[PDB]
Amino acid sequence: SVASFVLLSMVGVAVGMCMCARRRCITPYELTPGATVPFLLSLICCIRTAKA
Amino acid sequence: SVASFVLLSMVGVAVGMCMCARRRCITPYELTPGATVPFLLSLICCIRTAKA
Amino acid sequence: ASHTTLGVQDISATAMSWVQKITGGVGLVVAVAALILIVVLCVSFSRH
Amino acid sequence: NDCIFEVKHEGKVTGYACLVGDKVMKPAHVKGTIDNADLAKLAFKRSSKYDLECAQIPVHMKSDASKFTHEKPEGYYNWHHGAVQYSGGRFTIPTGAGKPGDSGRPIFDNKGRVVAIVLGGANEGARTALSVVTWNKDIVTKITPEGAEEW
Amino acid sequence: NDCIFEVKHEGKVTGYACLVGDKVMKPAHVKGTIDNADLAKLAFKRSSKYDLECAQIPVHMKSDASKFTHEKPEGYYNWHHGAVQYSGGRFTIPTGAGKPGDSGRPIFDNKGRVVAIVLGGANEGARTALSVVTWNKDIVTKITPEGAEEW
Ligand SMILES: CC(C)CCC[C@@H](C)[C@H]1CC[C@H]2[C@@H]3CC=C4C[C@@H](O)CC[C@]4(C)[C@H]3CC[C@]12C
Structure with a gap:
């Protein structure tokens, strides 16, 4: 029971870190007017292409 | 007692040399208007940027 | 005693690598710090 | 011109929002609701790093967004309350020209x-x-001048 | 040219302090404490290879700092005691156009x-x-021309 809890918790943390990293990495492009997100960056961030 | 003294003395010298290097490679940036210290150097010497 | 004296610092027991590891570790810190200062002095020297 | 909208607190005006290019921007330090309901109901992405809250403009009904450029040549610029002098990496105004809420x-x-x-x-x-x-x-x-405070 | 930045650091002043860009500057070979208090209390970094000491200009007096550039085209330059001829990358003045303490x-x-x-x-x-x-x-x-003396 404990081993299952701890291993699942570790995975949840890994995901939270990835989502935090994704938001911080992409913000400077989505926050900027007239800016377009690079194709490769959109694939890495797992986000929709450009502004649509 | 002697071995402890000598080893500690050697460390103190190593630190003093590092601090001397830290001042010598940075001072010219402080003297120059704008304090335009490059990012990597700021990480290495543990110093603050022009707008800090 | 049938033998002679052990009176030298040289005859310390084995498994004394702790002494060598500590001495080497501190010596390495000095060698690195010395290199850092030398490189900075070289750059400072060339600049005018 | 006329691309400026008011951001209001419950009891007062707190700041302004502007339509620039394809996105609507407001200062993140300003707490209030946009006077224009079309923008007030719009979701914004908050980033404390740049003190911004930004969202996409409903350009299908908001085609009056201002033009913009990334270029910053030396000279004077128009900031509504007068001219602002730009030199190096900084903008400078007369001391009596600035104010809180602006x-x-x-x-x-x-x-x-x-x-x-x-x-x-x-x-x-x-x-x-x-x-x-x-x-x-x-x-x-x-760009953050030393000793600068939010207005 | 039409502005004075030359603050005395001694009664029997030998050399002057000035405000350039965002830094306070004075020669490292001149003794005395900068007047007007605000500069007097500043700590300075010294470099013996540049004969220069510098400190950060206080924000409230930052607006009085002189403009700075690295650009150095051949031609003539101005100073408070006359003109300066810049030729071959070196600055030259007429003999008697300045003295020690200037x-x-x-x-x-x-x-x-x-x-x-x-x-x-x-x-x-x-x-x-x-x-x-x-x-x-x-x-x-x-830059230090051969035979140059400290002023
Ligand atoms: C972990 C490290 C510090 C262990 C080091 C052990 C050292 C400090 C100890 C262990 C055995 C000791 C030695 C035993 C024998 C002698 C011979 C004597 O006539 C002089 C002291 C001398 C030379 C001693 C010096 C200190 C000594 C070397």
Whole structure:
């Protein structure tokens, strides 16, 4: 029971870190007017292409 | 007692040399208007940027 | 005693690598710090 | 011109929001609701890093967004309350020209294009440094004069 | 040129302190404490290879700082005691155009921007070569003509 809890918790943390990293990495492009997100960056961030 | 003294003395010298290097490679940036210290150097010497 | 004296610092027991590891570790810190200062002095020297 | 909307607190005006290019921007330090219901109901992405809250403009019904540029040549710019002098990496205004509650107003160049958004400023003696948000060709960046405070 | 930045650091003043860009500058070979209090309390960083000491300008007096540039085209430059001829990358003045104790004075271009600060010079017949502090892109450098004396 404990081993299952701890291993699942570790995975949840890994995901939270990835989502935090994704938001911080992409913000400077989505926050900027007239800016377009690079194709490769959109694939890495797992986000929709450009502004649509 | 002697071995402890000598080893500690050697460390103190190593630190003093590092601090001397830290001042010598940075001072010219402080003297120059704008304090335009490059990012990597700021990480290495543990110093603050022009707008800090 | 049938033998002679052990009176030298040289005859310390084995498994004394702790002494060598500590001495080497501190010596390495000095060698690195010395290199850092030398490189900075070289750059400072060339600049005018 | 006329691309400025008010952001209001419950009991007062707190700041301004502006339509620039394809996105609507307001200062993150301003707490209030946009006077225009069309923008007030719009979701914004908050980033404390740049003191911005940004969202996409409903350009299908909001085609009056201002023009903008990343270019920042030396010279004077129009910031509504007068001219602002730009030199090096800083914008400078007259000391009596700045005020609290004025944050969110854009700075325009001689072509009417927005170059930066005003957040605040710092008193440098005979002149006041202006704290603004601007951008390069790729991403948004912020300029923060020493001792600057939010307006 | 039309502005005074030359603050005395001693009663029997030998050289002057000045405000250039965001830094307070004075020759490292002159003794005394800068007047007007605000500069008097500043800590300075010294470099013996540049004969220069510098400190950060307080924000409230930042607006009084002189304009600075690294640009150094061949031609003539101005200073408080006359003109300066810049030729071959070196600054030269007429003999008798300055004396010991007149050091620390900036040399200005045609836009009123500082390009160099005088430390001393070498008297060669009718002309004197100047020992100056000058700047290149993101670096401080010094020029010292042979036989130059400290001022
Ligand atoms: C972990 C490290 C510090 C262990 C080091 C052990 C050292 C400090 C100890 C262990 C055995 C000791 C030695 C035993 C024998 C002698 C011979 C004597 O006539 C002089 C002291 C001398 C030379 C001693 C010096 C100190 C000594 C070397």
